[PDB]
Design a protein around this ligand. Structure first.
Ligand SMILES: Nc1ccn([C@@H]2CS[C@H](COP(=O)(O)OP(=O)(O)NP(=O)(O)O)O2)c(=O)n1
Ligand SMILES: [Ca+2]
Ligand SMILES: [Ca+2]
Ligand SMILES: [Ca+2]
Ligand SMILES: [Ca+2]
Length: 341
DNA sequence: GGCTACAGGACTC
DNA sequence: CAGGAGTCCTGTAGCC
């Protein structure tokens, strides 16, 4: 199989640049203002200008400002980025029916039947990079390999504004050399408990007792890593269908007071229903982020669709449930709908 | 034993 | 100083 992965560069930031070219060349920081106090919130993402100085996704906005006080701080305008995204996804579909839109920012294309080899695949990569630049002036990075995991690693190595092919030999080389931390799906926690078994590379999973790998990191995860080490990994490119829709908001104040939280919970429901469009969920979950950043939740599945009214009442019951079974204070409250009809 | 629901865990962008 | 949205897996407990 031949997979061609497309990853838009500093997507949110670049879209802002396309809409306002004077930004070009400056450090741009796209932010999620929380509402609690001046500059409370976090960085959603930033361009390379800002990034090369340590301003990265997830850090607090005030910390970003300490590092880059004169950078441009823009509020997230997701709907805008989503519309530009949708248009680019449509361009990619001209290249293949077997397409997987993994996020607002990435897409996997199976071009096995469009191209004969990696040479023709690389060339198809330039063709795509060019198309997107012509139509939307967005630069992207193209990763190419025999499966989704290595096509993504390929792009991770070539961004930004790049294109890279990882043929069969480098796959073998990477299995040996590549820091297993850089493997998609392995975060700090997993990587810590991995690399602490001397497993620092994909190969190391082959020589360790299985019940043991699986003891530290779970079955699915160990099979995944091993199948990759054996160069026997295969996951087809697939149309993705959204399985949940939700909304979570940050309260001005942390609270444990039911009447004080309801307003937030209710607004989160309204926004959620809106996004459901015509989907009818059978399940609802009330999600709360506590005082200390711990996530708690209580849900319920119904044998029928959930009307907005039923969502309102059930959410309060679920919220009460949380309040009763957890003495902590809530800082963020929301809901998530799933199991659509 | 294994399938279901539910709640938490970990990860990705 | 700690936003937001969405996905997959696992441990536990009911049940067949
Ligand atoms: N922690 C994070 C990470 C990403 N984001 C959002 C979700 S999608 C948008 C992608 O922006 P981005 O900077 O282009 O992400 P990348 O790491 O792919 N940058 P790139 O090198 O272009 O692929 O960032 C976020 O809100 N919070
Ligand atoms: Ca990405
Ligand atoms: Ca990107
Ligand atoms: Ca063509
Ligand atoms: Ca990692």
């Amino acid at each position: 199989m031949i997979v061609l992965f497309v990853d838009f560069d500093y997507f949110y930031a670049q879209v802002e640049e396309v809409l306002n070219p004077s930004l070009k060349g400056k450090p741009v920081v796209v932010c999620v203002f929380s509402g609690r106090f001046e500059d409370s919130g976090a960085v959603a993402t930033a361009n390379y200008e800002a990034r090369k100085f340590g301003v990265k996704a997830g850090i607090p906005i005030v910390e970003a400002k300490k590092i880059l006080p004169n950078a441009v701080y823009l509020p997230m305008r997701k709907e805008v980025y989503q519309q530009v995204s949708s248009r680019i996804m449509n361009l990619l579909r001209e290249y293949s029916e077997k397409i997987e839109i993994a996020s607002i920012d990435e897409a996997y294309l199976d071009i096995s039947d469009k191209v004969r080899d990696y040479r023709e695949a690389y060339n198809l990569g330039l063709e795509i990079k060019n198309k997107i630049l012509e139509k939307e002036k967005i630069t992207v990075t193209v990763g190419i390999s025999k499966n989704k995991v290595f096509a993504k690693i390929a792009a991770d190595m070539a961004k930004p504004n790049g294109i890279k092919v990882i043929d069969d030999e480098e796959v073998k080389r990477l299995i040996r050399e590549l820091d297993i931390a850089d493997v998609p799906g392995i975060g700090n926690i997993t990587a810590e408990k991995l690399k602490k078994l001397g497993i620092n590379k994909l190969v190391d999973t082959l020589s360790i007792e299985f019940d043991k790998l699986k003891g530290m990191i779970g079955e699915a995860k160990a099979k995944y890593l091993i199948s990759l080490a054996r160069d026997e990994y295969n996951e087809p490119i697939r149309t993705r269908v959204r399985k949940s829709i939700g909304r979570i908001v940050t309260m001005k104040r942390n609270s444990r007071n039911l009447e004080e939280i309801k307003p937030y919970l209710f607004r989160a429901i309204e926004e959620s229903y809106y996004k459901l469009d015509k989907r009818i969920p059978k399940a609802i979950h009330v999600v709360a982020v506590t005082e200390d950043l711990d996530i708690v939740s209580r849900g319920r599945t119904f044998p029928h669709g959930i009307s907005k009214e039923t969502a309102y009442s059930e959410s309060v019951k679920l919220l009460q449930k949380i309040l009763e079974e957890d003495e902590r204070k809530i800082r963020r409250i929301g809901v998530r709908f799933s199991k659509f009809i």
